[PDB]
Write a protein of this length. Structure first.
Lengths: 56, 69
């Protein structure tokens, strides 16, 4: 019953990013998948474009 | 006139001269560069491992953050 609320709140998180500041999110998503599993290495320069739009 | 093989010595080619001599390395000076490269080696390497720790904790944080997984 508590797990039902987890998946419902998961959709609430992703919808907020898709509505406001979608351009830095899509560019960050292309950076992470182009490389193997560095996750944060060689992608920190593109991470600067992210969070800054979200800070508003 | 008689023509035969003529004698010539000029420089005498130098009879037995030493060519082997100490070059570049002296002794004590090589240890200053040798052990000096080691001390520079560890200090440069361990700073990268401290920068790896910044990535390490952040990597394991992704597992804790993901509960719908």
């Amino acid at each position: 019953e508590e797990g039902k609320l987890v998946n419902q709140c998961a959709l609430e998180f992703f919808r907020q990013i898709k509505r406001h500041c979608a351009e830095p999110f899509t560019e960050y998503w292309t950076c992470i998948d182009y490389s193997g599993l560095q996750l944060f290495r060689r992608c920190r320069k593109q991470q600067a474009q992210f969070d800054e739009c979200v800070l508003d | 006139x008689x023509x035969x093989x003529x004698x010539x010595x000029x420089x005498x080619x130098x009879x037995x001269x030493x060519x082997x001599x100490x070059x570049x390395x002296x002794g004590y000076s090589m240890f200053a560069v040798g052990i000096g490269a080691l001390l520079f080696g560890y200090w440069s390497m361990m700073k990268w491992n401290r920068e790896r720790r910044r990535l390490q904790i952040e990597d394991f944080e992704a597992r804790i953050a993901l509960m719908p997984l």
